[PDB]
Amino acid sequence: GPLGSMDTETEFDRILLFEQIRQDAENTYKSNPLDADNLTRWGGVLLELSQFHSISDAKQMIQEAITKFEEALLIDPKKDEAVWCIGNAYTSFAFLTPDETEAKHNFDLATQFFQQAVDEQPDNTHYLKSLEMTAKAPQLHAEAYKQGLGGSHHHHHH
């Protein structure tokens, strides 16, 4: 906890937090590519920083965030996190991907992974949300892209 206003922050302060992590994780990679913990945390942040970072960079950040988990999964296959992370990545990347097909394909992918995370502990509130999130994987994306500033609304009635 290197200093902090503690109130709301302009997000930046929070970005720095993730930054130091990314560097610590990324750097830790070469320091220990076996450390699935650092490999996983290296992703979690990527996803986080990806939020503040432009989608373009967010996407590329997610992609790598996935490949990162892969190696982590190699170190520890029981890493329900590395699995969920992979899912959380796809889910996020999907929202960034307009290609419903790809987005959906991803959303449905993160699902197959979530089943693993929960597998270890389905009592995990996090994994629960990750799973429940799939409930409207194709919808979240639709409403995600639909809800904003486009044009047409829809063609249906009550």
From Swiss-Prot:
Residues annotated with N-acetylmethionine modification: M6
Knockout-associated phenotype:
No visible phenotype. Triple mutants tom20-2-tom20-3-tom20-4 are vible but display a slightly delayed flowering time.
Describe its membrane topology. Single-pass membrane protein
* Tissue specificity note: Expressed in roots, flowers, young cotyledons and leaves.
Which regions does the record annotate with the repeat TPR?
43-79, 91-124
> From which domain of life does this come?
Eukaryota
Q: Which locations, inside or outside the cell, does it occupy?
A: Mitochondrion outer membrane
Which GO cellular component terms, listed alphabetically, does the Swiss-Prot or TrEMBL entry include? cytosol; mitochondrial inner membrane; mitochondrial outer membrane; mitochondrial outer membrane translocase complex; mitochondrion; TIM23 mitochondrial import inner membrane translocase complex
Cytoplasmic compartment segments: 6-150
Post-translational modification comment from the UniProt entry: The N-terminus is blocked.
A GO MF annotation of the entry reads: protein-transporting ATPase activity
List, in alphabetical order, the GO biological process terms annotated in this UniProt record.
protein insertion into mitochondrial outer membrane; protein targeting to mitochondrion
Keywords tagged on the record: Acetylation, Membrane, Mitochondrion, Mitochondrion outer membrane, Protein transport, Repeat, TPR repeat, Transmembrane, Transmembrane helix, Transport
Which family, according to UniProt?
A: Belongs to the Tom20 family.
Give additional notes from the record: There are four genes (TOM20-1, TOM20-2, TOM20-3 and TOM20-4) which encode mitochondrial import receptor subunits TOM20.
| Record note on quaternary structure | Forms part of the preprotein translocase complex of the outer mitochondrial membrane (TOM complex) which consists of at least 6 different proteins (TOM5, TOM6, TOM7, TOM20, TOM22/TOM9 and TOM40). Component of a mitochondrial large protein complex that contains, at least, MIC60, DGS1, TOM40, TOM20 proteins, and petC/RISP.
- Function of the protein: Central component of the receptor complex responsible for the recognition and translocation of cytosolically synthesized mitochondrial preproteins. Together with TOM22 functions as the transit peptide receptor at the surface of the mitochondrion outer membrane and facilitates the movement of preproteins into the translocation pore.
Protein name according to UniProt? Mitochondrial import receptor subunit TOM20-3
- Give the source species: Arabidopsis thaliana
Gene symbol here is TOM20-3
Identify the segment of the full-length protein shown: 1 to 145 of 202
